Each structure stands twice: as C-alpha cells, then as structure tokens.
Design an enzyme around this catalytic site. Structure first.
Site, mmCIF file in Angstrom:
data_model
loop_
_atom_site.group_PDB
_atom_site.id
_atom_site.type_symbol
_atom_site.label_atom_id
_atom_site.label_comp_id
_atom_site.label_asym_id
_atom_site.label_seq_id
_atom_site.Cartn_x
_atom_site.Cartn_y
_atom_site.Cartn_z
ATOM 1 N N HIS A 48 44.593 -1.017 -20.844
ATOM 2 C CA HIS A 48 45.818 -0.370 -21.305
ATOM 3 C C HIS A 48 45.743 1.147 -21.344
ATOM 4 C CE1 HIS A 48 47.453 -4.237 -23.461
ATOM 5 N NE2 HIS A 48 47.072 -4.451 -22.214
ATOM 6 N N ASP A 49 44.552 1.691 -21.553
ATOM 7 C CA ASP A 49 44.404 3.139 -21.574
ATOM 8 C C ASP A 49 44.479 3.659 -20.138
ATOM 9 O OD1 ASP A 49 43.815 5.767 -22.539
ATOM 10 O OD2 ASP A 49 41.720 5.518 -21.963
ATOM 11 N N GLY B 275 45.808 8.572 -17.057
ATOM 12 C CA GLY B 275 44.816 7.553 -16.754
ATOM 13 C C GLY B 275 43.853 7.224 -17.887
ATOM 14 N N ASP C 82 42.107 8.546 -20.105
ATOM 15 C CA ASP C 82 41.916 9.736 -20.921
ATOM 16 C C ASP C 82 41.732 9.478 -22.411
ATOM 17 O OD1 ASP C 82 45.496 10.566 -20.742
ATOM 18 O OD2 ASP C 82 44.419 8.808 -21.479
ATOM 19 N N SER D 146 43.913 8.346 -24.362
ATOM 20 C CA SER D 146 45.178 8.614 -25.041
ATOM 21 C C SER D 146 45.593 7.519 -26.022
ATOM 22 C CB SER D 146 46.299 8.817 -24.018
ATOM 23 O OG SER D 146 46.564 7.626 -23.300
ATOM 24 N N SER E 58 37.999 -14.138 -18.107
ATOM 25 C CA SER E 58 36.953 -15.155 -18.197
ATOM 26 C C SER E 58 36.317 -15.039 -19.587
ATOM 27 C CB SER E 58 35.875 -14.921 -17.135
ATOM 28 O OG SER E 58 34.933 -15.983 -17.108
ATOM 29 N N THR F 256 34.898 -21.193 -21.226
ATOM 30 C CA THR F 256 33.718 -20.435 -21.651
ATOM 31 C C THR F 256 34.115 -19.002 -22.006
ATOM 32 O OG1 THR F 256 33.215 -19.890 -19.320
ATOM 33 C CG2 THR F 256 32.080 -21.796 -20.290
ATOM 34 N N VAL G 171 31.248 -16.505 -21.801
ATOM 35 C CA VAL G 171 30.449 -16.439 -20.583
ATOM 36 C C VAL G 171 31.286 -15.862 -19.454
ATOM 37 C CG1 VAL G 171 29.032 -17.698 -18.926
ATOM 38 C CG2 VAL G 171 29.188 -18.501 -21.281
HETATM 39 CA CA LIG Z 1 34.310 -17.713 -19.019
HETATM 40 CA CA LIG Z 2 45.431 6.724 -21.102
#
Ligand SMILES: [Ca+2]
Ligand SMILES: [Ca+2]
Ligand code: HEM
Length: 336
Positions: A48-49, A67, A69, A71, A177, A196, A199
């Site tokens: 998300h950042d 990007g 950063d 923020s 995963s 999992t 894992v």
């Molecule tokens: Ca997994």
């Molecule tokens: Ca950001």
C-alpha cells in the site's frame, strides 16, 4: 567490507545501524522472530505504501505519489483514512516508534521490516534490501490501491501504470501465501487464504484453482467466492486473476515449484521497493537480512481432491504434475 561496532560484518558502513533495527524488530515487533499477524500486516503496508505511485497522474498534471516513501506512516492521519488501509493503525504506530528511535527513514524501515518479517516464515526467499530513501514525503493520492471489488482490467491497468506487467502482478500475489482476511467477512475472522498461512509456498496458487464448493461463513462476503474447504476464504480478485486469460498461464506455472515461486516474488518485490526512487542512488545492505528456515514439503492438492478438481485455465500449456494428499477434506483454523 566493514566491521560494525557490534562485531557484525557488512559491505558498507551505512548498513551498521540496521543490525540494531533488526534486533529491535525481532524481539518486540515480531515478538521473538515469529511469523504471525505482524508479518502479514507489514506485507499489506509495504504494498500500500509503494503502490501510491502514478506516472499517468503526473503526466495529467497532478501529483502521482512518491512510491515507497513511507508516506503511509509519515502521513498516516490521511492514508489510514482510506478504506483500503483498514486494520493497519496499531501496526503503523508500532513501526513509527522504531523509525524515530533509530533515526531511519520510514521508506527504508518499511522495506527492511518486510525483508526481516519474511525471514521468520519457512520457505521465504531472501529479499534484497536497499537503504537511502529520503525521509520526507507527501501523502499518497487516494484511489491508487487495487481492491478485491475491482475488475481484473482495473487491477491490471492500475498496476501497469505503476510499472508492473500482468505476470508481475501474479508474482507479487505470492504474498497471499501468508495471508488471512479480517475485514472482508468479519464473521470468520482471520480465515486463511491458503492451507499454510505460516509457510511461504505454492499452496495459495493451487488452492485458488480448485473448484469453489464451500461457503466458509454464515453468508458470502461482498468480495468473497466459494472456497474449496471449510475455514479457507477465497477473495473475488484472487479467484478471477487465477482464471483470467491474461493471467492464467503465469498463475498455473506458479503451482509446481516453491523454488521458482520464490525467485519471481523476490524479483518483483525488488522492483516495487524502488518505485519513486533511483536504485543506483541507493546502498545495498542485503547482507543484513537473515535466511529463512527451509521448506522441504512438496506442493500438494489437499483433502483427497485430485488434479481433476482443478479448473485448468491455461490449457494451451501442460498442467504440471503435483502430488495428491488423501482425504478427508481439511477444516482450516484461523491464522495465528
Ligand atoms: Ca502458504
Ligand atoms: Ca507511499
Ligand atoms: C494486486 C492486487 C491485490 C488485492 C485486490 C488484494 C487484496 C487484499 C484484501 C482485501 C486483503 C484482506 C485484508 C483484511 O480484510 O484483513 C488482503 C490481504 C493480504 N494481502 Fe493482499 N491484495 C493484493 C495484493 C497483495 C500484494 C502485492 C501484497 C504484498 C507483497 C499483499 C499482501 C497481503 C497479505 C500478507 C495479506 C494478509 C493480511 C492478514 O492476514 O492480516 N497483497 N489483500
């Protein structure tokens, strides 16, 4: 190479402060180098950042975001307000303290906490770690985070704008995963995305491809689809991406080898880590990152289900051979 005060060896002197950060994160944030919720939350945070970056917006005459950063931390008052960032408050506040106490930028910290957190989960590759991202940032523009309610086209176009090809979107999703959901269907809190959740393996790719036959909770969530067995949650976007003709073949090739999955995810993550920055202007401190314990288990089709239960979505290419485990159908416990 240089010998840090603590006696640790490294390739650059600016990598030294990170050994202190490591000890802090492993002991407190990760409560003893554990692979639980904090790791899963940090993986949502890094995505998300970083994804708050848009060359298209910039070209249109608007700020597109900086990007990776940090923020999301520096301007949490604004970013945590986005519905896509729900359930991240406590994690963000905990990370803020670490950055301030060690004098490291939030952009770097997020990337570092991600690498360290994954080393706590079996099967994880060793993520690259670069340091040097400026400490100042502007809040990310809204509506830049793909959601489970978006169509595949909308997700590919958003990710493509950021610089990711359809296959790289599939590679980045390997993080599912080690995932569960808390807000898509609160009735079944922390129901895992694969069998999992602790894992880093290919089970996520295999299990999302099985025919959906089970409704794990009292009702079907807004962005939920039938899953393969009790306790496992299936997100609409994940189910669609596994079957869409633009992403199906890559998804199918991610089922048979933990090795191959790890390499692709690592390469994709390295790319996401420098969105909004110039890699040549950063310093490599990858040697500070520990190795994760090995995962020797082979990929399997669980619950007595067989390859015949897979909804092959890329028939133009041979479906790999995968071991099959006897029944009965499993019933997943919530992720720790
Ligand atoms: Ca997994
Ligand atoms: Ca950001
Ligand atoms: C490209 C499209 C993607 C979509 C639409 C999507 C959507 C979501 C949603 C809605 C959740 C459940 C959040 C909650 O209810 O707690 C989730 C979870 C999660 N996602 Fe994603 N995701 C995407 C990609 C990624 C990526 C690129 C990463 C990181 C490399 C990531 C890491 C995780 C993890 C580790 C969780 C589990 C969090 C927990 O157990 O607390 N996701 N994602």
């Amino acid at each position: 190479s240089v010998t840090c005060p603590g006696g640790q060896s490294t390739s650059n002197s600016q990598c030294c402060v990170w050994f202190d950060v490591l000890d802090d994160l492993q002991t407190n944030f990760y409560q003893g180098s554990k692979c639980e919720s904090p790791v899963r939350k940090i993986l949502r945070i890094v995505f998300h950042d970083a994804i708050g970056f848009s060359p298209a917006l910039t070209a249109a005459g608007q700020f597109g975001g900086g990007g990776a950063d940090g923020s999301i931390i520096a301007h949490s008052n604004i970013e945590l307000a986005f519905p896509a960032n729900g359930g991240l408050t406590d994690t963000v506040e905990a990370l803020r303290a670490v950055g301030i106490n060690h004098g490291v930028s939030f952009g770097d910290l997020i990337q570092f906490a991600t690498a360290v957190g994954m080393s706590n989960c079996p099967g994880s590759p060793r993520l690259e770690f670069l340091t040097g991202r400026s400490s100042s940032s502007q809040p990310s523009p809204p509506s830049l985070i793909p959601g489970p309610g978006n169509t595949v086209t909308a997700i590919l176009d958003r990710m493509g704008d950021a610089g990711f090809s359809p296959d790289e979107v599939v590679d980045l999703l390997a993080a599912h995963s080690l995932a569960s959901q808390e807000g898509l269907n609160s009735a079944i809190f922390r129901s895992p995305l694969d069998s999992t959740p602790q894992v880093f393996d290919t089970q996520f790719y295999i299990e999302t491809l099985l025919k959906g036959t089970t409704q794990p909770g009292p009702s079907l969530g807004f962005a939920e689809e039938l899953s393969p067995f009790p306790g496992e949650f299936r997100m609409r976007s994940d189910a669609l991406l596994a079957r869409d003709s633009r992403t199906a073949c890559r998804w199918q090739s991610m089922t048979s080898s933990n090795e191959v999955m790890g390499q692709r995810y690592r390469a994709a993550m390295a790319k996401m880590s420098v969105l909004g920055f110039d890699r040549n202007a950063l310093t490599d401190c990858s040697d500070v990152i520990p190795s994760a314990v090995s995962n020797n288990a082979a990929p399997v089709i669980p619950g007595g289900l067989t390859v015949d239960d897979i909804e092959v979505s890329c028939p133009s290419e041979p479906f790999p051979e995968i071991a099959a485990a006897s029944g009965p159908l499993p019933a997943l416990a919530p992720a720790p």
